[PDB]
């Protein structure tokens, strides 16, 4: 009875579609990472170049993608983006299949001309897939979620938290499953599994999106050389000036600045851990702890929003993250690299930074969701994504400039500083919304 109603409701179908999409995306990302680390060796330069390419492409095309999402029907945009992403992933999987089958041959076919051709083709396909994924995220997590929630902020916060939990769980699980598949068999079987899973997921998510559109009737109403390139530049300029003129500019600015960091767990931090003499089991349990603290951050954000308010929740999350970051700053000056105390303190700071950062991210995304007109949602969200990946591009450039372990600690400090800047900027926004009642939570008395 009730179980069937819950499994038939729009929220569950949306959750299922998002879970399938993120599982497939994470599997494909791990496959590409394995290809890069094995065929070309453990080179940070190539990974940084790939990140540079994807970040720059999104930076340039974000306004265009947002405008396209804004000026078209909701069902068509989502279906087209999903089809494009899944087709791109399938083609990349087939190409990786053919590359992996001829391992020794391609390693000795020529000086590397065919190898570089395969690299650039994979990079282009991955760039297209990332653009499609960004379009899907903009059209689903910013447009459809609000319409499904309606006039209920608690429901919107719960959906955002559940999406974040699904993302964290798939991030911690799917790489392990696909790695076990690869290690029990061969990478070719892994790529085949990627391709088949993405095709079946394409079909299932198409059907699920149709069902979601049918179940919510409020999604059908929407309120609104040089000559060829004249209009995209106008769209870019208009989107950026509109984003700059928005009153929630500071919050998105700080969220973008928060991406300028090396204190994650999918970055060269794992390389530093390996260079400090830590086994893989320690890394696995640390990743599990990071996922657990992400879930804790989501639930803490929900409770803090319910009890205190959005802006004060953001302030509390920022203060927590800053405390974690100063713990890391204390860590870097301890004895160690320019013996276990330094790495232990750094990792604890990283995990607690993860929980604080997830709380802050949820606060900022809700603020952007509920304070933007529905006729400019896509363009503002696209410009926000563009700034986030601009900061990611800067991070990749910095990692390229200082690859040696010895300077890594210095890099850490820079990251910390930028985080502080972001929160400081958010603080100003808080003032512009709260004035002198900043440190007062609860009903007035």
């Amino acid at each position, epitope marked *: 009875g009730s179980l069937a109603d819950y499994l038939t409701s729009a929220k569950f179908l949306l959750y299922l579609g998002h879970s399938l999409s993120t599982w497939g995306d994470r599997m494909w990302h791990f496959a590409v990472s394995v290809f890069l680390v094995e065929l070309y060796g453990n080179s940070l330069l190539l990974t940084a170049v790939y990140g540079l390419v994807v970040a720059g492409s999104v930076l340039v095309l974000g306004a265009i993608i947002g405008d396209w999402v804004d000026k078209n029907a909701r069902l068509k945009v989502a279906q087209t983006s999903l089809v494009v992403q899944n087709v791109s992933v399938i083609l990349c999987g087939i190409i990786l299949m053919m590359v992996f089958l001829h391992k020794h041959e391609l390693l000795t076919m020529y000086h590397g001309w065919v190898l570089t051709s395969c690299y650039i083709l994979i990079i282009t396909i991955a760039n297209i897939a990332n653009l499609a994924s960004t379009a899907t995220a903009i059209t689903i997590q910013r447009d459809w979620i609000v319409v499904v929630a309606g*006039e*209920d*902020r608690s429901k919107l916060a719960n959906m955002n938290a559940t999406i974040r939990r699904i993302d964290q769980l798939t991030n911690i699980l799917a790489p392990m499953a696909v790695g076990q598949i690869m290690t029990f068999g061969s990478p070719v079987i892994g790529c085949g599994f990627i391709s088949g899973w993405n095709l079946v997921s394409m079909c299932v998510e198409y059907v699920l999106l149709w069902k979601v559109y049918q179940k919510t009737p409020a999604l059908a109403v929407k*309120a609104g050389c040089a000559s060829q390139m004249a209009e995209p530049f106008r769209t870019f300029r208009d989107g950026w000036v*509109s984003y*700059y*003129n*928005q*009153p*929630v500019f500071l919050a998105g600015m700080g969220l973008a600045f928060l991406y300028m960091t090396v204190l994650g767990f999918d970055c060269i931090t794992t390389g530093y851990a390996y260079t400090q003499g830590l086994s893989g089991s320690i890394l696995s349990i640390l990743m599990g702890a990071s996922a657990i603290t992400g879930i804790m951050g989501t639930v803490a954000f929900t409770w803090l929003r*319910r*009890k*205190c*308010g*959005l*802006v004060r929740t953001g302030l509390i999350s920022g203060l927590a993250q800053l405390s974690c970051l100063i713990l890391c700053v204390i860590s870097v000056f301890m004895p160690g690299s320019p013996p276990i105390i330094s790495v232990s303190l750094l990792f604890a700071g990283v995990i607690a930074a993860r929980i604080g950062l997830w709380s802050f991210d949820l606060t900022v995304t809700q*603020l952007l969701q*509920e*304070n933007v*007109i529905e*006729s400019e949602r896509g363009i503002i969200n696209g410009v926000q994504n563009s700034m986030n990946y601009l900061l990611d591009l800067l991070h990749f450039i910095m990692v390229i400039l200082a690859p040696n372990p010895e300077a890594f600690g210095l890099l850490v400090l820079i990251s910390v500083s930028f985080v502080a800047m972001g929160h400081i900027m958010y603080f100003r926004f808080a003032q*512009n*919304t*709260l*004035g002198n*009642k900043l440190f007062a*939570c*609860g*009903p*007035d008395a």
Partner: antibody
Amino acid sequence: EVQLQQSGAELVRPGALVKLSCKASGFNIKDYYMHWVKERPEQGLEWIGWIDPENGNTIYDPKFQGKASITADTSSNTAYLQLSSLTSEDTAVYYCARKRGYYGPYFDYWGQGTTLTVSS
Amino acid sequence: DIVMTQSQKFMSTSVGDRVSITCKASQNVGTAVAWYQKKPGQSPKLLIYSASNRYSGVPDRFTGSGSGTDFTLTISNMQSEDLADYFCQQYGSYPLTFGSGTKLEIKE
């Protein structure tokens, strides 16, 4: 049909306590921000403050800080404005307004307005 | 704070002529200006939001324009039902401030 009804025809002596109500029909005050606006006769429109009925966070304008107090009741779906230390300058017309978010584009629905006159 | 100044307080007009009402900001509010129209003895209504977007139900003769510091509301063809008081409100920053208002009266 979203509607907001208010009390009316308030006559009060200087230096007393005044309570205005704002009952909402067709929606829930919990999902919106409830604002209060004052209009002095032959004058402009002034902003008093806003309240969030979900949690009780109330923010006021600097001028109407120690004089006004905004409360809300979700069960009865009604906002309340409390005015204290009344003076002859406070005779005006008060409106109850609805806002979507912190920086919502507009006040879509307004109340009928309550006329407050203080006299001797 | 942000002070909104409307220059003219009484604009004399005739039926069937374009009417322009100006609104000036003390700082750069961006595109956050909403125009409200109110007849005498009734609650204020909604005409334009975000300085360019017209609300659902407003006649097409109302057009908003401007950005940054200067904003203007234009009526293409004045009718007898458009004689009221119009004011501009910003929402870029708190506390919210309203305009002084402009009253439209016919010519004779």
